[PDB]
Amino acid sequence: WSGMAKQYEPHRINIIDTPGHVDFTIEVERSMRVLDGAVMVYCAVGGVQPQSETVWRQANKYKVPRIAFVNKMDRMGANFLKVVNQIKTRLGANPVPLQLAIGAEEHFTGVVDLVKMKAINWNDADQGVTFEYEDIPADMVELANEWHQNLIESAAEASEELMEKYLGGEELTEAEIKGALRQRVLNNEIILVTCGSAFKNKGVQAMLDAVIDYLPSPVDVPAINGILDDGKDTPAERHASDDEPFSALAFKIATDPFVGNLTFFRVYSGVVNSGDTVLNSVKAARERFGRIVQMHANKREEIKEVRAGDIAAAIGLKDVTTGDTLCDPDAPIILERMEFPEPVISIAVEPKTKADQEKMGLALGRLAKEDPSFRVWTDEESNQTIIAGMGELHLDIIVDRMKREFNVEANVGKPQVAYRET
Amino acid sequence: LSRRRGMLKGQESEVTGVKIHAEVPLSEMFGYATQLRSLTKGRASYTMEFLKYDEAPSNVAQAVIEARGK
Amino acid sequence: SRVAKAPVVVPAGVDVKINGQVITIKGKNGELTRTLNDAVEVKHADNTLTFGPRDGYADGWAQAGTARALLNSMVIGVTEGFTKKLQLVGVGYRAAVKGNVINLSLGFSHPVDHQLPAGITAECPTQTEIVLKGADKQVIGQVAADLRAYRRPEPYKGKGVRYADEVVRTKEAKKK
Amino acid sequence: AKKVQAYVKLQVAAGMANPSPPVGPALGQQGVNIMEFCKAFNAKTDSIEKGLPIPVVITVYADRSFTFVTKTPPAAVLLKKAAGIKSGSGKPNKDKVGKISRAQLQEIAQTKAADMTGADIEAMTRSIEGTARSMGLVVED
Amino acid sequence: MKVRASVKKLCRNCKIVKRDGVIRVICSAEPKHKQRQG
Amino acid sequence: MALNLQDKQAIVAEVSEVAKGALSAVVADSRGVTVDKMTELRKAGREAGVYMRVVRNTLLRRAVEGTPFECLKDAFVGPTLIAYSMEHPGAAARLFKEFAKANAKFEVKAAAFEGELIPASQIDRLATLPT
RNA sequence: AGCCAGGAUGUUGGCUUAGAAGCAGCCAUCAUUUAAAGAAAGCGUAAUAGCUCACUGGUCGAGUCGGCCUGCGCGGAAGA
Numbered sequence A: 001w002s003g004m005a006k007q008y009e010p011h012r013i014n015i016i017d018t019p020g021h022v023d024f025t026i027e028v029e030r031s032m033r034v035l036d037g038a039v040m041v042y043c044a045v046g047g048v049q050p051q052s053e054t055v056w057r058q059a060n061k062y063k064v065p066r067i068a069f070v071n072k073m074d075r076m077g078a079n080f081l082k083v084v085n086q087i088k089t090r091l092g093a094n095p096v097p098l099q100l101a102i103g104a105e106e107h108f109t110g111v112v113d114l115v116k117m118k119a120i121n122w123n124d125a126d127q128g129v130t131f132e133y134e135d136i137p138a139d140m141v142e143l144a145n146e147w148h149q150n151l152i153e154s155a156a157e158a159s160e161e162l163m164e165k166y167l168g169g170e171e172l173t174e175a176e177i178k179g180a181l182r183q184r185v186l187n188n189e190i191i192l193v194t195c196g197s198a199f200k201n202k203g204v205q206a207m208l209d210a211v212i213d214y215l216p217s218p219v220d221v222p223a224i225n226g227i228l229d230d231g232k233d234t235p236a237e238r239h240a241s242d243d244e245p246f247s248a249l250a251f252k253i254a255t256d257p258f259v260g261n262l263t264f265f266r267v268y269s270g271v272v273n274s275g276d277t278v279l280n281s282v283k284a285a286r287e288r289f290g291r292i293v294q295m296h297a298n299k300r301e302e303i304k305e306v307r308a309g310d311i312a313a314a315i316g317l318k319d320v321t322t323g324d325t326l327c328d329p330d331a332p333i334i335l336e337r338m339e340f341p342e343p344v345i346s347i348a349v350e351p352k353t354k355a356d357q358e359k360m361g362l363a364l365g366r367l368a369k370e371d372p373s374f375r376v377w378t379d380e381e382s383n384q385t386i387i388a389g390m391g392e393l394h395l396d397i398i399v400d401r402m403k404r405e406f407n408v409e410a411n412v413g414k415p416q417v418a419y420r421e422t
Numbered sequence B: 001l002s003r004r005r006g007m008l009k010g011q012e013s014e015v016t017g018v019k020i021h022a023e024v025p026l027s028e029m030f031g032y033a034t035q036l037r038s039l040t041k042g043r044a045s046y047t048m049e050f051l052k053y054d055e056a057p058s059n060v061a062q063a064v065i066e067a068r069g070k
Numbered sequence C: 001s002r003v004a005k006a007p008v009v010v011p012a013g014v015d016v017k018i019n020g021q022v023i024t025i026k027g028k029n030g031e032l033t034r035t036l037n038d039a040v041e042v043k044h045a046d047n048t049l050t051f052g053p054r055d056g057y058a059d060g061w062a063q064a065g066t067a068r069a070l071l072n073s074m075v076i077g078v079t080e081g082f083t084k085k086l087q088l089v090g091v092g093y094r095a096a097v098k099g100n101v102i103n104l105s106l107g108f109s110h111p112v113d114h115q116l117p118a119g120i121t122a123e124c125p126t127q128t129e130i131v132l133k134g135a136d137k138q139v140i141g142q143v144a145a146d147l148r149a150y151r152r153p154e155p156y157k158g159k160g161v162r163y164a165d166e167v168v169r170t171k172e173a174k175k176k
Numbered sequence D: 001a002k003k004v005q006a007y008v009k010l011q012v013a014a015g016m017a018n019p020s021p022p023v024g025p026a027l028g029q030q031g032v033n034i035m036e037f038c039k040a041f042n043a044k045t046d047s048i049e050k051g052l053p054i055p056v057v058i059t060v061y062a063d064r065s066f067t068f069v070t071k072t073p074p075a076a077v078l079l080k081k082a083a084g085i086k087s088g089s090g091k092p093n094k095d096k097v098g099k100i101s102r103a104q105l106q107e108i109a110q111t112k113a114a115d116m117t118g119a120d121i122e123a124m125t126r127s128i129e130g131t132a133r134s135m136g137l138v139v140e141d
Numbered sequence E: 001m002k003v004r005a006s007v008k009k010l011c012r013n014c015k016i017v018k019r020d021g022v023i024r025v026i027c028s029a030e031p032k033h034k035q036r037q038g
Numbered sequence F: 001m002a003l004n005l006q007d008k009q010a011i012v013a014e015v016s017e018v019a020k021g022a023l024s025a026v027v028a029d030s031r032g033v034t035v036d037k038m039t040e041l042r043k044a045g046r047e048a049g050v051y052m053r054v055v056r057n058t059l060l061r062r063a064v065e066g067t068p069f070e071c072l073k074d075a076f077v078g079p080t081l082i083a084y085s086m087e088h089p090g091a092a093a094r095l096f097k098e099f100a101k102a103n104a105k106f107e108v109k110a111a112a113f114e115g116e117l118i119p120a121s122q123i124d125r126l127a128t129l130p131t
Numbered sequence G: 001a002g003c004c005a006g007g008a009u010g011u012u013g014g015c016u017u018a019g020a021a022g023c024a025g026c027c028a029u030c031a032u033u034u035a036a037a038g039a040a041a042g043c044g045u046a047a048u049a050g051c052u053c054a055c056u057g058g059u060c061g062a063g064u065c066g067g068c069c070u071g072c073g074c075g076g077a078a079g080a
């Protein structure tokens, strides 16, 4: 990225999309830690919802600095400010609206910046490449300026003298504004809210410059601390700069037939290069490093080099799994992450064909490694395995994963409860 | 919960909702979360932990005696 | 019946025409005519209007009271007129009025357009609320209930046409 | 005058009067803060006793002000630890409300007649007398 | 509604009416108390 | 639950003290709380005595049956709701004016505290007595 | 009948010292206060709530309130 024609240096923003169901919520737990900033998506009409709040808590756990987008301004009943208030009062946040909505469902055309006090008015879904900025649409600037005042109200409290300077009757510049807000936004202070409809392609183009402009960079965000057998205070500061021994963090494991294993990882510190050696410092294992495939407009980008903060996926080695550290033999063995949600709904399971319980057991082995938020059980009553999952759907999209992945049909059932007698 | 089996033992205020203690049987909690999501619009959770054992007249255990025979 | 024992004291400016049994009553709004139950004897009697159960009619007292109520409302219609107030609960449920036809976007598939009866003046102080005005109470109430029945209030979130004073008794969708 | 937002006629053991997550799922929905929740209600209770629920008002202000005049716990309510018997109503006819004496009950009704006032203190005497015998057993003196 | 052969008032809000020679029950409070005949 | 016999009995019992007494007060309370009628009765009893029941008795023949014992020109209290209170400490005492002083503060209405034509007093403060 | 208020201060009655908080844990409770507070019979029930027990209070002023026996009716009551 670089900007909306207003652009400054292409930045490799590294992006991991997020799902919206708490059932597979480890995907939010790890991928909140792996994350530097956070885009709190929102329905401009739906507002905040049982998962907006759920993932908000998820985010709160990693204290991630989050700004919010309000998509779907074209659908009827969508209003940016309302959703803003929804967040502010359902989540207890300080939603500085660094933007504003020009229209609602029928007359949504642009976004009022409260600092440019201008409204870039793109074109629609494909053509929303028109970057014809427009100055102060008075219809909106009747109070867009006073919504800029809210923003200024948040930046003044950013520093001791900055508030006083704001009380000096003086305004703030295009850098002191962001840097004051950012310097703590990096530290998760207030959520900047911009409206748009990525379907209708407005708002999104700005919703990439405020990313660069406020979201912490791995250099703006505080340094992460590793862990060892004994977890120190800073057992190994693994700052962004890959000066540390290669020390990534592997968070996901994937599949490919022509590439084999497709493990994912965000490198916290250090640099591994197309064939190296690292240990499962968390598993006390070891192996080489062959064919990195960093994903950008994915063409099987079999990159021979992955560096600080550069999320990529590795092939081969042996074991890394979802929160397991990626470390050089120097091994800041552990990263604090040894957690994933516990199945809140367990259930017994057995194949359709009775001699497939061994294959459904192994399916559960694979599908248990594939996401950490899905346990497998094997009680001793008869034989039945208990697929302890997060949600009904969380472990029901794996009962069908055996049907899809492992071409086995299964009929689930309640676990047999241990009925002891006396 | 009263409908389920849960015997109320206290409930308070927690933060935004309330934390609610009840030593509900384990049998009575096998999809609870799912039911809970539906009841609360997906906005509540429960944490259950086997504690002890007790009885409820259910010759359902007498039923499962008829296995590989009667 | 007990009501029948109370004269309909005509207001100032109302023109009553006690023609046999059937009677017309003029007022500031208009003229209303009503066919009395044959069991009713009604007179003006100096700005009043009194009802007495005809002889030969055991059910005269109550019928005379029905006449007392029918003629009292008529007076009030011709002088004041009766005004019913309705609401549209439900998103996108809107009931704009175009002269005597209400273009309802109640979100079925189709625009519901209710052509008002002669005598009924519909107003919408809002996209989503009606104010019927008319001379006759029964018929304006009839119109209100007719309208309300198109997209009736509903028992969960009240969505649907409701009277402005309507107390929609709702309930929860389910526990589930 | 603020409306109904923290309405609970409940006073927990007043070592700290009405703890927040101690009460139950009716007082959870009450915005009243804790900074002055037990500042003037943990110390100024010494007018009756410290450790017993202070029958108090639930009047706070919309301006985050909190003003109320706490009345006192009844002598019978104190008659769980103060009048001997920990039991009381429900079976004062099938049980005793305790070895309650009116030589103390009257003295307590006269000296604790501050919160529940009236035209005559004899009125409060009879008030407490009905309060105690509402169980079916009251100090018999 | 119920068309029980025995309509009764189940509520302070239930009411007996004879629209057209038919004995119905109308509970203002319970629409379960809505009965038709008898 | 005022029967005709019991009605004339309670009316007469509450009317004799006012008939042979001094100037007292009554209220006009068709809209008041239990607390208002409890605390006002307690206040009236501390001022004068705990004998006054805060119940209202403005029926169409309570005073037209009790009041006509003496000074019958003082029978103009057949009006709406009335729950009265006595004032033994002097006719038209402080208590005889505190009600009208409190008529707009923590109370609905007080029937203006009409007084009584025991001596046929006119519109003035019935305290023409030097000290 | 209608219409205009009201159904306490112990009052979460201790009331199975979690409250079943004026109306499920359970009993008796006006005890100034009273017409009110029942200290419970649907609303929360965990309270609240506003109606609920009621009661007065007011309004205006003619019958009204209930039951018993009763007569005749009504329904109950669908086949080819």
Ligand SMILES: Nc1nc2c(ncn2[C@@H]2O[C@H](COP(=O)(O)OP(=O)(O)O)[C@@H](O)[C@H]2O)c(=O)[nH]1
Binding pocket: A071, A072, A073, A074, A075, A196, A197, A198, A199, A200
């Ligand atoms: N009117 C409007 N429709 C949208 C918007 N965003 C998505 N949609 C549509 O809603 C559907 C889902 O959108 P999308 O974000 O791709 O699906 P997701 O996987 O649930 O997040 C699609 O059919 C979109 O066309 C928007 O901002 N405005």
